Swiss-Prot record, chain A:
UniProt source species: Homo sapiens (Human)
Effect of residue 69 to A: Inhibits HR-mediated DNA repair
Compartment(s): Nucleus; Cytoplasm; Cytoplasm, Perinuclear region
Residues included from the entire protein: 379 to 672 of 674
UniProt name for this protein: Fidgetin-like protein 1
Gene field: FIGNL1
Coiled-coil spans in chain: none
Length: 274, 281
């Protein structure tokens, strides 16, 4: 066990940031209900959820980017009283030692949630995948592996033997997009009407959760970015966020909003998903 | 493009693990530290937002130092600066810049700044920066960091954080002239943390029970206060035998978990350093 690798994992891979609550996650009502029931409760009380009825050792969250997979991973950790380790699969590419160290550290910090983003690149190098399967199969340890992917088609039958529950985390529905605007705007000075909120919701069809969050952030900076020179005005004097700030924000975010393959995800979800 | 001579993997490591992709942080998410918040809005955030107006020497500083004991909100502040300035946020511990291999630490520092340049405006947050700016590889990575910090189409802000501001070398100190003391939460800030965190839960605390929680958490950090609420939130399910709201007993039990990790800090050292070298409030 190299102390420099241990340091790297403790400093950069282990999460030390704010906790995440269920209410921070908009939509995905089914995923949240299922995770609470089959993952978090058994993680909190393995003395009652014995079995068989214990938590899975591995799950898969899948869907397009920015739908809340990492958020859900962090929430699993927070709500189960666990430590959270987050790493992208490519950062493992020494790789074998990194994987081993990652599980060793997690074992010392139990219960632990290990979140691996783009896990498809790990499960398809051969040597890294082998050591990872060694580690997950071995995992008595209170470790949950949460894999995330935008490419579930690259998660094969052998990988599905390890990631035994798989949940589709889709783009937010209208109700979820509304949820996000209201939640983020409640933290700001904002003067939107209910009609204007509905318009924002209608105009953000196909936006991800991350796009909705960047929309709101851009909208929040609109007032300051709209002041013309004449510096008298101090922060407390600036006007509230208004519909125009959102219309302007749409012009920033919409060009980064990707247009399509929900088919692939829905197909896979019907086949292998909860 | 400006990245064609860096190794693809070093780029992707910085892009994946060092660059933050997490939720935004708002000023209201940070309890207490009124002086630091007001100051930072004025001399950092507004200039970063309106560099058409805040030109030349009215621009933001190239670097600032946050100091105090662990868990007081330094990283939270760094991320809030980025959020509120419309900037990308990169966070790294100083030890993660170092390597056993000759020339590799310097390479990582150079890569970090090159990726930040591509993603500008950018905030680069460096934890335990005293280690980086200490007092041959240590000498060399320090020198390289200062080259990057010294080297203006650039819209990069370095935010260093330390529990040991006395150990930053004098020369390096001149690069971070703005130094803000981020202390342990005072009683009103502890209360605010409890209220904010319990507003997201099912909770039945009386006003008196809250005041009792605040009295009993003297000397707790913001992180301690957060761990306290987290442990209290899990009390109801942990009290079931083979769900009720959070109550005062869950906090009393939570105190027995958190308190063993809370120990007295050298607050005189921070206060004295803030008086002599810092912004003074
Ligand atoms: N369902 C959601 N509800 C609220 N916010 C979300 C949701 N999904 C994404 N976000 C916002 O976007 C950010 C990025 O989401 P993340 O969980 O990293 O997405 P993924 O891992 O699915 O790509 C989050 O930290 C959050 O601010
Ligand atoms: N001033 C504060 N207000 C609210 N929460 C805080 C504060 N300080 C710390 N916390 C909580 O503790 C966590 C860790 O704090 P962090 O900002 O990493 O501290 P530091 O960098 O000072 O060690 C934060 O993500 C937050 O949940």
């Amino acid at each position: 066990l190299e102390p420099k690798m241990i340091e790297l994992i403790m400093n950069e891979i282990m999460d030390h940031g704010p906790p995440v609550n269920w209410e921070d996650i908009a939509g995905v009502e089914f995923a949240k209900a299922t995770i609470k029931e089959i993952v978090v409760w058994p993680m909190l009380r393995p003395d009652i959820f014995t079995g068989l009825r214990g938590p899975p050792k591995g799950i898969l969250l899948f869907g397009p980017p920015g739908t809340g997979k990492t958020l859900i991973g962090k929430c699993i950790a927070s709500q189960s009283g666990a430590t959270f380790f987050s790493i992208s699969a490519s950062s493992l590419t020494e790789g074998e030692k990194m994987v081993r160290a990652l599980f060793a550290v997690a074992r010392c910090q139990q219960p632990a949630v290990i979140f691996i983003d783009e896990i498809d690149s790990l499960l398809s190098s051969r040597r890294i995948k082998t050591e990872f399967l060694v580690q997950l199969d071995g995992a008595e340890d209170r470790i949950l592996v949460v894999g995330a992917t935008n490419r579930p088609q690259e998660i094969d039958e052998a990988a599905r033997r390890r990631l035994v529950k798989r949940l589709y985390i889709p783009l937010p529905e209208a109700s979820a997009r509304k949820q996000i605007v209201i939640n983020l705007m409640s933290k700001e000075q904002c003067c939107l009407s209910e009609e204007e909120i509905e318009q924002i919701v209608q105009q953000s069809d196909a936006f991800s959760g991350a796009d909705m969050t960047q929309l709101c952030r851009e909208a929040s900076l609109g007032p300051i970015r709209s002041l013309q020179t004449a510096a008298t005005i101090t922060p407390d004097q600036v006007r509230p966020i208004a519909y125009i700030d959102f219309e302007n924000a749409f012009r920033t975010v919409r060009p980064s909003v990707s247009p399509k393959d929900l088919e692939l995800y829905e197909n896979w979800n019907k086949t292998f998903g909860c």
